[PDB]
Amino acid sequence: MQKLTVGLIGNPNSGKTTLFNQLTGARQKEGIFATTDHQVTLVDLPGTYSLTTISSDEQIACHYILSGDADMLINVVDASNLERNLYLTLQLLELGIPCVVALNMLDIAEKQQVRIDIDALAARLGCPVIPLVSTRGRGIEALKIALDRHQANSDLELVHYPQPLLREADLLAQQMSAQIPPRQRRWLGLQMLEGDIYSRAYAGDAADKLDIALANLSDEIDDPALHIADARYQTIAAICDAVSNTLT
Amino acid sequence: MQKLTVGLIGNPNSGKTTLFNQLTGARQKEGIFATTDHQVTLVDLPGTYSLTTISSDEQIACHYILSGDADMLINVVDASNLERNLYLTLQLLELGIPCVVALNMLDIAEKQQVRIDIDALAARLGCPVIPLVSTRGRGIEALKIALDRHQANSDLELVHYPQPLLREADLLAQQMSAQIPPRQRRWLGLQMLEGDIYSRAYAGDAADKLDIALANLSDEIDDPALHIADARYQTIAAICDAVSNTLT
Amino acid sequence: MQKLTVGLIGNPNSGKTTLFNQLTGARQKEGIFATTDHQVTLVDLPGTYSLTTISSDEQIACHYILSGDADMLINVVDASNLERNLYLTLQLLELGIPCVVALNMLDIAEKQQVRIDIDALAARLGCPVIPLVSTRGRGIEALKIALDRHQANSDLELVHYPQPLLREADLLAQQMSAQIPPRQRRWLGLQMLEGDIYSRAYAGDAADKLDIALANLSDEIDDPALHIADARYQTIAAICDAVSNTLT
């Protein structure tokens, strides 16, 4: 037996607490349950649509995610609203924290005639996708196996960012804290280029080494924030069109 | 042209003889037919739900499988009863004998609104899955190509067994016949730990080096037989939920 | 920014010009448009069902393909007639020119109850498959990302040809122009063995080093042309049965 700390992260109303209660066998606050190989400390985090805030029940999950307290995340995704839910999923995968997708509410998806190829999605994301109906306890055993087996997400180029955006993000990834892993550093630097207020606190040579970067791009990109978000949305649409019935 | 000996193995009533008659062009007992690269000697084996018997038209297929007479198996699986049929399939894949899944009765599956992602299943099993309707001769040519191309199953950890169970299975895999390949030895040792009566005959330091093993686990596992079977069933459920419409 | 020359190739009436107009933003003849990384010169080629003619709006596309003018192809495939469209696709993949499948008319496929697993098809073909509805501009952004990311098709044995056919094709691949890459040479040699009239012009030791080859096979294959075509059709049927609802 090894120890694992796992965070439940997902949009508001995606079924995180329901899944929490199922795993921990809660009576009708950290949880603890056993898998085959792990004693898992489980943290139910407040819902969030995104790890980016430009101005402001959480940016609590983000701060929790970046604290290094979690070894792995369970990203709870509502299957009936896939494309909307996948924005947060992509941010987590760009960050590189080991994760498993708990693709929840599949009974609701089925009622609305939504079809998702589970393993196709997993191969596009580079992490396991475990189908669940959390209210029914369906898929929990498979989720527990995936927590014992998953070690690291696949190293995919997920989002296809214009090279000028990555040049200037990577320069910032060179300034900052250096302790903090490269994947996280480039992520922090794109978050900075989007106008995220919380990410400078995690830098090193921190804040407005950003003003040089954001001016180094006027010959190239008009609104970097909009270009970064758009590249993300494009990626998610391409995934949903391939693995789901969303194209038509 | 090379020679191949192929066994047809599957549950009772899965379409083995029908497929046999199609491949051999039998008139309305070993068969022989040509693929592009092989002269195939085909053996129609008696149906079985499982290669485990704790007390007792076959354990004939099992004895045939373990004799080394077959180079490859065609595992004939009834698509309309996937989860039930996959128990035998998993045993064959744990054994490691080269195999191809002939996913038969897909017309019946379709009538009962069963949807199976063929290549997703193949990637989860680690061997080719060839969709058939054997009564219609549909898929036979693709099956023949797969017999020429398939060499070895992928080396996947299929079933996620508690480590104490594998410790004690592997010790037995150390005793026995040593001629007999490691994959087959660990398989024989888990079969022993489940109470299979036929597997001691295939050991070496044979039988009740099992009593030491089965007592070496009372600090850990209550009923090893039940724990092994459950791990298997869990694996199969996880596969069917991902690649089929069984979750909901 | 790098330069790319891309040919649009596909059967008559598969939506090539529609896709051309969408990419180039044509007003209601080469095009030019930007992707993230490339300035793409786009060539709308005349439709063709096949790159083989034994006797004779094109063999223009074939001559264009073999000229080396295109860096990459977009193979425009009508999803509502997959199996028929895939004959040309296979020829292109056997040739080895970098390509992306634009799986078009998916709205029509959906109306006729056709289901295609997009990523399963991509893995069977060894190149990206981008789902489109070209009249709606749906999927164009994902297509543009794929043109920036795709470098080389996967090196799969697609079609399972009787070894005598490949022996004699490869001997011819030894004669010819030697400048011309091995994959293209074997392709030219199978085209010769099928009776293609245009391929001798691209040989070296050219034409009727074919008469020796075609007589070197009477102990083995009756009609090599029919055997080659059949192997191709078999391959396509096997693909469609796995990734589409065509088996039953």
Ligand SMILES: Nc1nc2c(ncn2[C@@H]2O[C@H](COP(=O)(O)OP(=O)(O)NP(=O)(O)O)[C@@H](O)[C@H]2O)c(=O)[nH]1
């Ligand atoms: N039909 C169905 N409903 C579900 C499933 N999972 C959760 N729910 C329902 O969805 C509701 C919201 O679930 P809950 O566990 O509180 O969500 P949460 O994501 O913890 N939301 P919050 O961010 O407000 O904490 C609950 O009524 C629960 O019963 C599911 O798989 N299917």
Ligand SMILES: Nc1nc2c(ncn2[C@@H]2O[C@H](COP(=O)(O)OP(=O)(O)NP(=O)(O)O)[C@@H](O)[C@H]2O)c(=O)[nH]1
């Ligand atoms: N609709 C349909 N029926 C099939 C198909 N394959 C086999 N059958 C039918 O299923 C029945 C049982 O088939 P058979 O070939 O004897 O099965 P077997 O697996 O050899 N059974 P046994 O273990 O008793 O030897 C036969 O009537 C056959 O016609 C299939 O693809 N679709």
Ligand SMILES: Nc1nc2c(ncn2[C@@H]2O[C@H](COP(=O)(O)OP(=O)(O)NP(=O)(O)O)[C@@H](O)[C@H]2O)c(=O)[nH]1
């Ligand atoms: N419903 C639907 N129709 C489409 C789509 N793509 C093209 N079409 C329609 O199909 C017709 C034929 O398209 P077009 O672009 O000329 O095809 P082409 O493959 O260039 N044919 P040609 O070989 O004759 O050049 C046009 O009326 C177009 O509107 C699609 O995704 N869905």
Ligand SMILES: [Mg+2]
């Ligand atoms: Mg909650």
Ligand SMILES: [Mg+2]
């Ligand atoms: Mg029979």
Ligand SMILES: [Mg+2]
């Ligand atoms: Mg699939």
Ligand SMILES: [Mg+2]
């Ligand atoms: Mg046209």
